[PDB]
Structures are given as C-alpha cells and as structure tokens.
Symmetry: C4
C-alpha cells in the first residue's frame, strides 16, 4: 500500500490540499544496541516543505582547561549530517534520532547524571514552504527535565482505506521500556570484553 | 561535437527556449563489476534547473533488536552525496545510480529475496527553475514490483546535425542483460577468495 | 533558565520584535589544549537569520615550488565545515573558533612570526533575513596587526529577570591571558615526547 | 594594503557600484609538485555574488566492463568540494584548480594521450546576485583542444593607489612553462622510488 504515488502525490491525510510542532519531550533508549536521543517532529498538514533539514544545538555553559568561562556555549548535535539523513522528507511526523556515541556530548551521561546536568537542546527545522515559496525556520527546546530517560515514542501512523492517517493525539505521547541506566561510554566499556 | 557551447547554451533539443518525469521502473544490474540500482530522470524541455539535486529515501517498516516497531521508517539511499554526483546538471535524461554496497539497504537482497521484500523507494529532485526563479520539488516512487532485476535502460540520446536529440518514447524503456542472481553481499563473499 | 522557549521564541533582548557587526580584532589562545584563532560575530537585534553560516578565507600572495606567483591567493580557513558547527544559530554574539591544526595555514606561525606575515582573514556570514525573506551576505576583514596573540574575548552575556541581555559595549573588548609563544606545530612537537 | 575594508566593502575596481566570463581555455601544469587542471573565472564588475560556488562535470561517453554504452556520461570533477574551497568569494578573477589525483579522471592522461581523448569539461558557477536577489547559473565548456598542456594563467591583478585593478585584456591570456609530459599516474609511479 503505497506511501507515495507514481506522480509524487502522497497517500497521507485523506482530503488535504498539498505552524509546525515538535514533541514536548525527548526520549533516550536503545535502538539496535546503540543508545539514542530522540525527539519527534510533525509535518504541516496542508503543505509540503521542500529542502527540509533538521539540526540541533547543545546549549551548555562550559569552562576550558585554561579557565575561560563560555556561557551558554553552542555545540552541534549530530542528527544525520554525514549521511544526509538530516535532509527530511516531511510528510508525516518523524522521530529524529541522535545516536549517542564517542562524539556525542551525552557520551558520559548516565540516567542518574542526567538530572544534575544543566543543558538545553535546541532543535531547528528549516525548509521552503511548498505553496508559499518562502524560507521557514521552526524552533523548539528541551531542557534536562524534558528528556525522559528510558522511553520511546508512541506510534501515530495507521493505514485506513488506502490513505495513511495520523493520530495527532498521540503525537507527544511516549511509553516506558526496559533500558540500561548506564552511560553510553560505560555501556561501551562493559560490552567490550 | 560539443554538448555545451562556450557561452553556456546547450546543443540539445533543436529550437527550444531555455512537469518532470521519472522512469516508471528502476533497474538493478552490474556496472564495472559493482551491482547498481538505477532509475532515470528527465529534463524539462523548456527550462534549466539551477542547483539541481537528487536524493532518495527508503520507506520500510522495521523492528529494532529491542522490539520497537517503526512503521514506514525512512533511510537515505546513497546517490552521490559524498562525491557531489547528486548535484545534477540536468540538460537531458540521466540514469541515476545507487551502488549497492555494504552501507546500502540492498546489500543482503538477492533476485529471489527481492519480491518478498516490502519496501518502497522515494526519489526526490529539487532545484530552482531557470526562468521562474522558484524552488521546485519533483517526486516519484518505486515499489518492489517496479524494480526490474537484471535490466538496463535503453539509451535515448542521439546526435543529429549538430544538436543532440532525445527519443522520449524510449525514456521508460529498458532491456534485459546477463546479471548474477546473487545478492551484493553474496557476490562480495564469492569474489573475495 | 531557558535560552529558547518551547514555542521557539528566544529569551534574549527584552522587548525586541523578532547591520551585523564583526569584532574589530581576532584573538589567538588555547582552548582545551588546542591553539585557536577566534573572532566574534553579533546578532541582529531585530530579526532572526535563517540558514546562517560562517566561512573565512585567507588572502595571502604565494609562490609555488615552480615559481608561479599567485597574488592575493585564497584558501579556506576551517571554522566548523566538517561537523556543521559553521551552521550558526545566531541569537546573540558568538565567538567563532578556528582550531589551528596541521591543516590550518597558521600551523607554522609563532607569536614572533606573526607580525612579519603579510596576510588577511576575510570573514563572511550568509543567511536569509527572518522577516525580509532575502539573502544577506555580511563581510569583514582582519590583517596581521588585528590579530591579538595571547588574548580572549570578554563575555557579554548576562541573565536578568528571565531574559538574557547583551552588553554591546564589551562586544569588541578582549583581555590578556597566559598563552605560549610557540607555533602550533612547535607546541605539537614539544608536547609529543 | 587591504583587500577588504573592516566594513566589508572591497578595494577592487575604483568607482564601481557594488554577464560572467570563463577563460576560453583551461591549462594543466604543476603546482607544489601536484599536477593541476585549471581554468579562470571572472567576477561581475558591478555586483557581489552571494553564496557563490563552482562545480565541473566531465562529459565523456563510456563503456562498462559489461558492455553498456553510456553516451555523454557525466562525472563530477573535484574543484574543492571536500574542503569547501568550491565556495567562492568572487571579487576578482580566480583560477579554479582541480588537482589531478588518483580519483581524478585525468589520472591516466599524458600530454600525448590528451588530444586523442574525446571529452568535454563543463564548468558551472551558481550564486545569488547581491543586488538582484536572484539565483544565477553561469556555464561554459572546454573540449580536448581547449586544454593547453604545460601552461599557466597570466596574472591580471595589480595594486594602484589603494584599490586593486584588473587588466581584463589578460583575462584569457596564458604563458608556457616547463612541465613534464608524463601522466599524473606515471609521475606518481616514477617519483615513488
Ligand atoms: Cs554534509
Ligand atoms: Cs534547508
Ligand atoms: Cs555533502
Ligand atoms: Cs538543491
Ligand atoms: Cs559540509
Ligand atoms: Cs547559508
Ligand atoms: Cs560538501
Ligand atoms: Cs550555491
Ligand atoms: Mg538556498
């Protein structure tokens, strides 16, 4: 049952005519053995967004080994830059995933360490509005208390009579799932041996 | 016999004035010993497309090793991201090629495995219309039954009286060619020894 | 105390309504044991800049090992191209940092060698103006006498009653800090052993 | 003597107000021991070009090891994609250089082999016009007889009374220079031992 028709029209949202929401929370949990920070990003019901892309910054004041204090310092969280998976094809809500690896700022952050960290994730979508011919930027924010450790996003997408429908009342909904409380670094150590 | 004149005008489509089609099917076959998924993408007879680029997504529901079910999950099929061969110079139909390697989702997919897979390839061209000064997105789709294994695209381009002409009646046409029925992974294994 | 609200509005510049300055000087100094060339770049008080990015060129006449003289030759100074840290989220002044490594043109340049070099750094920001829907380019320049060796930028950002304020009278201000007078290459050599 | 003023205005073309030409020929010759294909690209006297970038394609019909004939097949010639040196700061004519290495299509092409090759280089600049707020594409072409082996571009840039002037009558001019007649591959072989 096709997601996209041969002519490029999408079988989503029966009877559409082709403000953008981010999930209120972010989740952390395992996917294929890798620990992932994930948040959700909705489509615009009534228009495509050409050249869509997602990026995320980490706002976190820091001190260099030489004592320079950098308030609200920015660093770029990896959400598919290298493989071009940041280039979105937004035609229904997507879970964006940041794999927490050796280069990720969350490498050394455990379930317990987490609420003691003072940091904020800024998510930024940017694209051109299909109809409007204009460049949009949509932004949102997550702080330490809004990253739910050990959770996943409820799915929202069902197939009904040859179109795909979105239950937007589940958009922000998440559920709990068995998930180690160790930091990614620790997990790596433990696993390797 | 020049494809492009010193002043930048192209010797294609005698008497042009400078809707975009994708081939109805995709083909898989060997090119220089590498197995390739290929589809074709036409130009617009009557205008250049500045900053053209092609990308492709794989729509395929999946289950993580932790049992999270991701319906119609997206992953980015490599069509020249790294070398900038995705940056198209569209002035006649082009065969876009995805080399099926260790990173490709088709790595483990044989001729027989193929029709049993439930997946869909979304192709998306994007550029600015030379004349119209506006950002376009053109899309199309291939499902398992529309990828012809062991085929190639008929050529369409002939040189006639100092211009190059396109036989658009061959645009979607393909022909059969000797092609192993083994998956790319298998071919690799076999070859290496 | 949030930098960005859940709805994407920023808590910066109480009572704003959402010309761009570069710092007059550049500084060189250690950050986390790496030697860095840094300059500062302000926001526009009264509008966001979508798709912001920074690049920098090195203007420096040179002679090839074959005696070709290239006047005012250009080479690209690395300011976060690879990790996408050049993709700015400009909502207050940012210190842009170029880590002076083996690929950097300053690799072999010491504190003493510096004023004897005849070179110029061109910095170029580019983005779309949130409101104006138009592509802007802002440029500035640093010459040998405008790179202060052994300095850092004064911070400018303070938190006041739930908004963040910018002391623009400190924008261009810098202070001295203990910093080795050896070139990056030399430091590397010395350290490694 | 500044190339760019602190406020971002350029000291080029006294009394300007801020059609684009490519050199008629391309040259091949050594730069710092590496063999380089080079062509020249002028600025627009009377406007900046924001977000400028250069790419080049190789048009060359080919036959795969499986006998598929691909007429006027395209492949992307590397002109600074990886280091972002393709991102031009066009404010006077620039020599664009493609280093002929193991990945370059000219790797195996000698001075003698050259005129027997049937190939064409398409060069494409793209950017937004500073004033006009519009996306431009400028194109040109080089065929085998227009790549002068063993040459260099005459310089065109002189400094006069605090502005830099361009002698546009030298734009297309080139001069001969001692240059080995061996292919890049061959040179590599020879040198390594
Ligand atoms: Cs990238
Ligand atoms: Cs974008
Ligand atoms: Cs890329
Ligand atoms: Cs594009
Ligand atoms: Cs990049
Ligand atoms: Cs940009
Ligand atoms: Cs790139
Ligand atoms: Cs561009
Ligand atoms: Mg653009």
């Amino acid at each position: 049952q096709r997601y996209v028709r041969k002519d490029g029209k999408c079988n989503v949202h029966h009877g559409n005519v082709r403000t953008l929401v981010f999930s209120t929370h972010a989740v952390i949990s395992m996917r294929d053995g890798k620990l992932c920070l994930m948040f959700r990003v909705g489509d615009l019901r009534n228009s495509h967004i050409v050249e869509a892309s997602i990026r995320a910054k980490l706002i976190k004041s820091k001190q260099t080994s030489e004592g320079e204090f950098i308030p609200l310092n920015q660093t770029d969280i990896n959400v598919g830059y290298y493989t071009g998976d940041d280039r979105l094809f937004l035609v229904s809500p997507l879970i964006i995933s940041h794999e927490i690896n050796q280069q990720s700022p969350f490498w050394e952050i455990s379930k317990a360490q987490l609420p003691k960290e003072e940091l904020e994730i800024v998510v930024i979508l940017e694209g051109m509005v299909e109809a409007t011919g204009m460049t949009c930027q949509a932004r949102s924010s997550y702080i330490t208390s809004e990253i739910l450790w050990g959770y996943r996003f409820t799915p929202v997408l069902t197939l009904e009579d040859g179109f795909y429908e979105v239950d937007y009342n589940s958009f922000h909904e998440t559920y709990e799932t068995s998930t180690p409380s160790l930091s990614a670094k620790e997990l790596a150590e433990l696993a390797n041996r």
